[PDB]
Paper text:
The viral non-structural protein NS3 is a membrane-bound AAA+ ATPase of superfamily 3 (SF3) with multiple proposed roles in the norovirus replication cycle. The full-length NS3 protein comprises a membrane-binding N-terminal domain (NTD), a helical bundle domain (HBD), and an AAA+ ATPase domain comprising Walker A, B, motif C, and arginine fingers (RR). Through integrative modeling, we propose that NS3 functions as a transmembrane RNA translocase, coupling membrane-associated genome replication to RNA transport.
In hex-NS3, the NTD (residues 1-61), is replaced by the 32-residue cc-hex coiled-coil sequence. The resulting structure shows that six copies of NS3 assemble into a funnel-shaped hexamer approximately 80 Å in height. The HBD and AAA+ ATPase domain form upper and lower tiers measuring ∼70 Å and ∼105 Å in diameter, respectively. Unlike the C6-symmetric model predicted by AlphaFold2, our cryo-EM reconstruction adopts a split lock-washer conformation, previously described in other AAA+ ATPases. The six subunits form a right-handed spiral with a rise of ∼1.5 Å per protomer and a gap of ∼6.5 Å between the topmost and bottommost subunits. In our NS3 cryo-EM reconstruction, clear density corresponding to ATPγS is visible in all six nucleotide-binding sites, although it is less well resolved in protomer F, which lies at the seam of the hexamer ([Fig fig3]). In five of the six sites, resolved to ∼2 Å, we observed hexavalent coordination of a Mg²⁺ ion by the β- and γ-phosphates, the side chain of T169, and three water molecules. Subunits A–E show the γ-phosphate interacting with R276 and R277 (arginine finger), as well as with N259 (motif C), supporting their classification as ATP-bound. In contrast, subunit F adopts an apo-like conformation, as the arginine finger is displaced across the seam and does not engage the bound nucleotide ([Fig fig3]).
Residue numbers in the entry:
A (entry chain C), B (entry chain D), C (entry chain E), D (entry chain F), E (entry chain B), F (entry chain A): 64 to 363
Write the structure that this text describes.
């Protein structure tokens, strides 16, 4: 087997990456894309050494693989420790879609999320925001984008509290149950949310302003053809199946002023104007805002 | 020796599974039948290796078997990881039977669940939905079909919340008390439910629309001969014992318009009509809908 | 010597048992008596193996016994898995005794439960139902008969919920507080209940019909001599102790039509008549019904 | 060395005792004295074996000693299981002292409890019932006698329910919070209650008769001398000291009819007569009743 | 053989630290800056030893490094023991910023915390206070400044209890979950807090006075231009963002009397007056107070 | 071999200690000072053994050190068993201080605690009692004096329960998390408590008298000059500092009647008179009382 040459190559890779990491850890952690790439490369080298050890029974290969796993673990631990000491995080981009039941919010949100995660980085991931009745985050791995379906189904005050905690630039600790997950932090870039409620928070809620100002895009949706069909021919499934289109052109979307809390233009401070929009335009605006915030956080 | 022959066979099988996983993973997880076959093959190879190891004590044999077990576990973990990060799931098929007490709903539900599980896949398995007194999902193993009896017995609103959560195409994390089951999800293909309440949810409930649209087949059951005999010959066990047939002829079934909530054909949006049905026709329709949805999920 | 032949016999027993299990696991689990007998034989084998291992001291016997107990545990685990995969259980036989205070319902119920447990299976056990202030089932082990000493004392509607849950053929999950007890279900064959209330449920309760149909035998008890003795000469302990009898002749028993809720013969659907009865006749009838149900559940 | 010979001796005793447990499980679990002595000897043997193990240095003797320890552990577990499988328990002897404040019934109750505990078994323990504030029983240790001070106090419905639960011959399970405390029985033999209430339960309580029948000795206590001293010489400490006596002769006690609930001799069924008594007659009668019940249960 | 020479130098440094520690543990404990520098040097040396051990593979270097780290751990444990027995600590300096939402409290607080952490020590760190949903302090590493964002968002009274416990000179033990972190204490020097509430505690609170006196600098903030722009042009993101400045000139700050609880000058024991302040005046005053307290504690 | 001679001398000293303890178990277990001195001597022997092991590690020397540490462990286990088997242990002296907020109670309490610990024994330690947020005692080391601050801040009921449990003369077992700590006894001579609430318990507490009787010294504090200044100059911090003297002469201390619950002299048994006191006078009286209590416990 060509074990010696691959071992030498991975040795060179790990040593050069070790020195590179040791150089400027502070700027590296403030550079999100570079750090993510470095972690991915470390994982690739680790799994490659693991499989190389697995397929060979030579004790020398096993010892070398153990040494390389030791080195890679040390580097990953040092970088993770530097990242935990940070005192700020980027402010995530939050999109919240409100509309009647059965019109297509969930599948549109899935499309938006995948497009965004691809745009931020090739190989980006989508994660799940645990909902009420689950109080820990042990399924979380720090993905680029997060999905939150049925926000406000029941217990909307707790939904507001979670949203205020995570939609911010101040660091945050997350409750976990497993021993090795204690002391985890929320470091995702974007959040997409679907709800049936009339807004982010109730109009009599104490923290109305704090939660409303944290939503970057607040979209209100309808679908006239779906609703008309369901109204005139109840129980007919083929017609309704015909009312939906593969480019989401059945959804009619309006956008509210940044910081609003209903579909009439009211914000906690003044009155603005609603404006029509589509799903491509929303994707373009969201991508632009994400890149802008990323650049300004790098320059911070 | 036959032992080394079986060892070579299982080595070839694990090599085939490894190369299949390495080639493509997203297309494999998007193909539910192929992924399940993959899992079955890996489980059978693991069990055969374990029993063969137990039947002997040769150091070389145990070493080879432990290495093979490690490789099998690695492949299984990789597939599990790929499935955990899916952004969508197939929408389950949900049947809810309402009717007066004592007439035979639970038996019909078990018949339907067995046949459905076998038709979806040879060796289907049916599982249990925890009821309102149990708040954790330990004891769920990703079953093809799930059975849920006494829906709305005391706490119909928590049952409504649970049903809305699980019946969807949005991935979901379940609450479990063991550490090793932490952050697991719901991946079932159908749910069969029996009820004594007038419908899926109260007419004054807030999430009436969201809950009703998620019910695929709403069946209303009666049994006139049984009710007559237990009315005119109370306390007589034998006359009542004689009113049940081994093919469910005693049950008389009506089907409501998809999205309704009562006997008279009312829906949240319109006013449709009822339709007489039988248990076998209902089964054929459920199989047809399950196949349609599975093909669409594989394509999308 | 004795150890060699004993371990050879144990090996033969375990191998033939493994063959039988592999052959007809499903038949066994559907055949209650055979499954119970095989489980008891496995318990005997494990106990004998551990005793023999402890008695002697040398590597050969200890290693052989360890392997044997491991294989026995694997067989028991596979059988338990198959038993947990079932879609149905046998409907338990339920007896409820209602009468005025201080006449001897508890002693009679213990007599009945002991006789029933002995008849269902030589060496059967009797367990306890967590009454009302304990919400967990961590003492439950899967006994033949269950004893419910007070029912409806302080919260009768919660008692009705629990009785509806456990008196069924649908598989059930039990709430437990220990880690190793998570995902436990109810498999007992008979339930004897003593009460101080008018009937199984309040007359205006909402689930009267569901809970009253599930009581096989509803007995109303009295003791005219005891009541006369304590009404004419209050405070006399000697006369009271004189009143009772070792053969339970002091109790007079009436039987209501099945599905009734009071002692006037009323049922939720009709109106029957009351019958006289005794403890021995009750025991004979209950054994007959239990064997009938066991045979019919097995023959499927 | 000598460690051989001694081992033989001690181990023989172990197995010897095992024999008298194997053939007499019913008797040992029936009578508390024999089982208590058996446990005492078993733990003495375990301590002796630990001492020998720490003293000894031969691998063979420590192997034998740990084998003996395992044998002791399994025997103790068997005894515990047989005890936990009981379908009945001995009925407690319950004394209730009804009297106004500032007469000295708490010290009298402690004296009675101590003498009873010594009589029932030498060097017995005395425990405290949870004080209507903790709903769990974590401190409980199965004491011979239980003392309940200030029964009632505006929370007498819950106290009535608790007394009905514990004063019985049916097995009971207690609510706890610790993992190892789950599923705990009740095993005490006598209860002494002191209260200011006018009886065991309110005259309108639903469970009046059931609660009244379980009280063995209901004694109404009065101290005319102390109340006279308070009337004549308020704030006089020397007179306060003078009124009390070391022999409790200052307490005037009326014994109520068996099963009564009032100081006028009223009973839920008839009318009786109050009698005069004292501390020593009460203690003698309690001891006699306890011995009667204990032997009756032992032979059954 | 430079590795041996550097290892000998490290050993000499370890011996120097060992002899230094024995000088006076009590005074070194009293001197916080010296203790922090000593621990920093110790951990840096140990990390260097471990890294150079990882670089090499010969037994000699690893053995020498194990001995050196054993000495290092001995010293670290001795100093930890000395530091754990103290009966007093120093009072942290507490800054609390109160103002309307969205004006820049969190970013100003981050600025202040960074500057103050560097001012206290060259290279000091900032850490995160656990919030109401997280229950354990496993992310705490004894950092020199602490951040607390969103104080009193949901449960203000629990926040008051926590702040009263941590702002004090009495030693405090912190709840945690990992075993090795059982029994660690709070040792930070400064705390920076932001809130939307109108003061440290609600006026009707039982512990108003105890909590108010523990806050050293209470600042009330307002940004009139930001409020004007967001009121006149609701939804104009660029116009609003043009109002924020890199020198925090947009935010106007008034300092309240030591011990006050609102912005009208009121104190629990009287009424004072408000004064104007800025970022740099706050920073200089906080540094002066911190240095004063550190010196006074040193002398004590 | 000087190492062998030193090890033999240490072993002979250990054996002498064992024989002295065995022949004088009662005195060692009773006299607190004797037990502390014995523990310190054993700790010194352990330190010498560890130093000897560092000096040499020959296999014979290793075995000798193993035997020495085994002897020391035997001594520790014997002492622990004797103390656990002890019927009772000396009860501590409680000094509770109450007063307005921010007058200097914590610093005075620390001063008094240090002085007491030094008086009772040279090099006497001081410990911190866990507060409400912590429920485990893993940081307890059997200190001479315990210090408790902010008693009754949030959990006055649970604080009262802990005060009743802790001052009792019966043996008490402490909760702990780590496996070794499990089985931890409480042994300490004095408890100094600083409070903001009036009196040890509220006037309506059912166990008011029982918890008051556990308090030996009850001090009420007032600092009239500090209060007047902070009333007249709310914001002047230097003026506030001017009022505190390094001899604690700014405090005014009153002492309440034995058993009292408030500062007006009222007692459960009547009423009394307050007295002036000072910190040194209180210290001398407390030392006298603790010495008398220890003497009477030892003499028996
Ligand atoms: N783009 C689409 N292509 C095909 N079918 C669609 C599409 N969008 C919606 N549907 C159909 O409409 C159903 C509604 O799906 P969802 O997107 O979950 O609706 P919804 O708006 O989330 O409803 P709520 O508010 O959660 S009750 C789907 O299950 C499909 O049957
Ligand atoms: N197909 C059948 N064959 C034989 N007996 C039957 C059949 N269906 C019902 N029964 C009998 O009728 C009883 C009715 O029980 P279930 O089937 O559980 O009725 P149900 O509709 O679930 O009533 P509820 O709503 O749960 S009270 C059964 O327990 C059997 O004794
Ligand atoms: N078979 C019997 N032999 C001897 N004494 C008996 C017998 N049956 C009842 N007794 C006596 O009568 C009492 C009645 O006790 P229980 O059996 O508990 O009566 P009960 O019907 O359960 O009353 P409730 O409803 O539980 S308050 C017993 O405690 C005995 O003293
Ligand atoms: N025989 C006695 N010997 C010595 N002191 C006694 C005696 N009887 C009463 N006393 C005193 O009387 C006091 C009254 O206290 P308790 O005995 O608790 O009164 P009590 O009857 O319990 O009041 P209640 O009903 O619980 S409020 C005791 O604390 C003793 O000091
Ligand atoms: N100094 C600044 N430099 C640049 N942008 C700023 C600055 N201050 C505020 N902003 C912007 O305004 C937003 C206000 O954020 P925060 O500082 O978190 O406000 P806030 O005072 O904490 O509001 P609350 O109380 O948390 S609702 C920031 O997220 C930035 O987008
Ligand atoms: N002897 C002293 N010398 C110097 N400053 C003192 C002295 N006593 C008190 N002070 C100051 O006054 C403050 C009062 O704090 P504490 O000693 O904690 O008072 P306190 O009695 O504990 O108040 P509470 O009840 O905890 S709110 C201290 O933090 C010091 O700043
Ligand atoms: Mg949706
Ligand atoms: Mg049913
Ligand atoms: Mg009873
Ligand atoms: Mg009393
Ligand atoms: Mg903020
Ligand atoms: Mg204080």
């Amino acid at each position: 087997d060509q074990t010696e040459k691959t071992l030498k190559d991975i040795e060179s890779a790990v040593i050069d990456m070790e020195v590179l990491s040791s150089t400027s850890v502070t700027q590296l952690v403030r550079d999100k894309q570079s750090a993510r790439a470095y972690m991915a490369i470390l994982d690739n080298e680790e799994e490659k050494a693991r499989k190389l050890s697995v397929r060979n029974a030579d004790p020398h290969v096993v010892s070398s693989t153990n040494a390389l796993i030791s080195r890679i673990s040390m580097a990953r631990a040092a970088l993770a420790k530097a990242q935990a000491e940070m005192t700020s995080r980027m402010r995530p981009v939050v999109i919240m879609m409100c509309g009647p039941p059965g019109i297509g919010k969930t599948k549109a949100a899935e499309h938006l999320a995948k497009r965004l995660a691809n745009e931020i980085r090739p190989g980006g991931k989508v994660g799940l925001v645990p909902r009420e009745a689950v109080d820990h985050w042990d399924g979380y791995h720090g993905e680029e984008v997060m999905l939150w379906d049925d926000y406000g189904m029941t217990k909307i005050q707790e939904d507001c509290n979670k949203l205020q905690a995570i939609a911010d630039s101040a660091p945050l600790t997350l409750n976990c149950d497993r021993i090795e997950n204690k002391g985890m932090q929320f470091v995702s870039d974007a959040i997409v949310i679907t709800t049936n409620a009339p807004g982010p928070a109730p109009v009599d809620f104490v923290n109305l302003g704090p939660v409303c100002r944290r939503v970057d895009f607040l979209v209100y949706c309808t679908a006239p053809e779906v609703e008309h069909t369901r109204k005139v021919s109840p129980g007919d499934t083929t017609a309704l199946k015909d009312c939906f289109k593969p480019d989401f052109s059945h959804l009619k979307m309006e956008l509210a002023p940044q910081g609003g809390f209903d579909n009439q233009g009211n914000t906690p401070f003044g009155k603005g104007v609603m404006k029509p929009t589509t799903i491509n335009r929303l994707l373009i605006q969201a991508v632009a805002l994400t890149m802008e915030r990323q650049d300004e956080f790098q320059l911070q």
